[PDB]
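In practice, a research group might receive sequence data for several interacting partners and want a quick structural hypothesis before committing to experiments. The following worked case mirrors that situation: the sequences arrive first, and a predicted assembly follows.
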Amino acid sequence: RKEQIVDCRAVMGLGEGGGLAQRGTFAEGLRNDVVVVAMSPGRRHITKPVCEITYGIREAGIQTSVLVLDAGGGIPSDAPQGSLGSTFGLKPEEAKQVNRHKLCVIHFGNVKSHIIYKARLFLKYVDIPTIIVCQTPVDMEDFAAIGIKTKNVMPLESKTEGKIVEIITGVIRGESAPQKKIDEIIESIKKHLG
Amino acid sequence: MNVLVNNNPKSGKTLEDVIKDEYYIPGSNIVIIKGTATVIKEETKKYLIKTTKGSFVVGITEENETVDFWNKNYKSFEDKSLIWKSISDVSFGSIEIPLPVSSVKQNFKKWDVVLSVSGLDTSEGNLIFVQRDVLELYGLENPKIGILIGGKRVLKTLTADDRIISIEQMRESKENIDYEITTNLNKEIQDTWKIYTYCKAEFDGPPQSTEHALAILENGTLEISENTNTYVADCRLQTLFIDEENPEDRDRGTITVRNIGNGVGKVYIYQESRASSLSHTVVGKVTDGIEIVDFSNSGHITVKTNPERLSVIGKTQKDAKILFEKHGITLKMEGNIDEDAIIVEQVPEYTMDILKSKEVTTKGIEPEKLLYVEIYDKDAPTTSWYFRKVTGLTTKRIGTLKIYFKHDDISMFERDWDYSKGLLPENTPEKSIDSGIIAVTNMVKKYKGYIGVRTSSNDKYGPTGETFEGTNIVGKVVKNSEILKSVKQGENIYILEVN
Amino acid sequence: MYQIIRYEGGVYKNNILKEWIEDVGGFIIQEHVMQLDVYMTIAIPQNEIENFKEEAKKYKGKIVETPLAGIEIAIVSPSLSRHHLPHIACDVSEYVRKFGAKPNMIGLAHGAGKNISEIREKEKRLIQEHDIAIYVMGNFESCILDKTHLFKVDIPLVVTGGPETLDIPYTYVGNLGRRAQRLRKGEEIRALRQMIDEVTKKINDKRMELSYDPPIIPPVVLKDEIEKRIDEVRGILAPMPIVTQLDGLRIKMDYDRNHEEIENVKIGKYLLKDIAYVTRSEMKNYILIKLKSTSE
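A structural hypothesis for the assembly, expressed as tokens:
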């Protein structure tokens, strides 16, 4: 039980009845232990699955920062035949803000082919162990099939400097995460952090 | 009758009489100041005092209703003694306070101005100056009126014998300056009317930026293109680059040149003391006669630059000799020595460098080696502006064109890949191009901005080897020729505009 | 002199507007580009306010008067858990942000409970470092009344809670208790506006206190000078690299490594150490700058 101070973002939210976070913003939790990365400030990501993980970690006694990606929706431009609909990316300042944390927790969606390439682009610049929280059942090997460093299934030619340290399945976008999922995430963080 | 002019009074009724002696370029603005109003307005959100123990500063914060009492009953609280200094803080008075006394009581704060009625009787209302944080102790609807901060020691040391005598407020005074702008001469002056006619500019800065400012003020007048409450700017040279940083304070009457961005090259004169800026290069200051800058909102202002612009490029050799010897500068000749030889280049070419080094190397040219050109400014405004910028005719009287590529009849000049931006097709040929025509390839072609001229005529290609839709005619060579055929690649030819 | 406002407009031709602001002597305190719109918190001299309004209406921008865009507020929640943090506390913080302030969530280590709640000295000092503190309390009158020892700081205070009216010796705003939904009902919005009005009144009072004995240099221009001189401020990864307080600044750089450089910064003709109190902050070992008054 120790005081937890958060550096709130410097910019306001999305209108009056909208979300409280803003795209492309960072909220440092002083002591940098865990950063929760949200693809967007929208209802599909913010306060339904992300602030729940945030308060779970903050209840476990681990300070948490929340970073909302400027462009977190879509697939990276390096995906086969390029991207479609939208382009996923990570800014150098975003990478630096992530890389000063001990661990990262990132929330992903449903389609497997999107998640694998998004994680590859994310870990091309992030060098700390990360935890993938997605809905679909994804195996901790399809990431290695495209080159991602993975704790259990390493690739022969690694294209990323970050290690996918845990994959947690069953967390739906825009829906309240049950206490069981929060407990699993907290246990994984505790056992893979200290 | 007897009016005060500048620093030496005059008497002439009409403006012409009093400005005859004052040097003044016609067309500029004339500033007249009538006097000072010195309006004294006091609203006193913060109130002062003159006590026997000193002077504190109170300040009303919470409106409620007791501030409305105070507004005029503070003078009724004038010359009142301290009533008590007990645990109920220090209270003064005691005079009538008709504000309805409510038994309901509200919390107050440390050193807070309070008008509580001590005893629930209208006539005994105390000016209770709270010292300590008091919880529910008092009465009245909401005695909170203001907060004491300034002179807290005065209120603390105040004893029963001491009184507040005179209740000062703050005595806040404002100033208004009467002004009218004019450019009439035949008007009647009544008496003691002050006139300003020009301003004096002292230049001290990096050589290139100062030369830019001098070129702006070579004619003695500064156009007012933009005006705000803090500056007036000149936009005659808004697309000319400079690479110099002089980031110091933009004080009152400071002259700066913006060196980056959309407004690179604008010359600013600041009417307010502002902070330093990395995008503004200070080139000097206005010493005296600031008011003409302060009050002018548009038009022309006559400006005198203390260091005369020592750039003699359109002059003859004897004029440069006499002007430089009258400034006490050692002089030497490089090119043509004849007294009527036109100067083409001077080393150093900047006034600040010349003054700091006290020597000039002047290069003249042969009478037949100077190329005479005429520039179509009305026909192709953007292209002519680009040509003037690239050849340097915007700043000096003689421009330099460098030979870039040559073959037989065609001689192409170098381009500036900084001024060739809006090179839309402007003056494109309709018939066969005649000989001795200067042209610039527009943005249509790959080699946009390259200037060239050919000594013959063809019906298919312009002077730069491009088709007619890709060349816009900017000007022609009028007098001196047969030197384009005897100049090698990389050599510079010098041009003179003859309009 | 320098009144601080927020400009909301597009990124197209925003550089020309920034050049105009630099020309007239203003400062861009905050900048954020979302996708195609940019929000700028700008401090410009009062004599150029109408000029800037005219300029903004040329770019089809919008001027929003921010009455709190010079202060940083300490929103104090009893904990960072699911009870207070993800709702109400964020609503308070974001509503404070909507008026220009810079909030900081302060989650007390032992703030929860009725008789087991306590506030540490370090948390007390950290709260005191701010300009004003907003407390987000529960929705039981007895629990709040038996919790007054929490609000012991010599800082302007606004307490929010469930019951409509409380009998604490502080400013209180009711109908803002511990909830679990986003604050979107009309009554909740009205209570948020009431809290904003209370903090605005306290801040304006404190502004008058400061105006009695003005500081030698305004905090905003001091921040601008520090940015121009110190070349490490663009490498700060914190949300607000330099925070503009009421009578000072917060520099989010290491104190042990940069206090000597910060102190030896020449403003005007003075050295910074002679006009401001540079001290280490309880906030992540940052640098806190407190301006002196003209009296000393």
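Before designing any experiment, note the following. The longest strand of chain A covers residues 164-169. Residues 120 and 148 of chain A are 6 Å apart (CA to CA).
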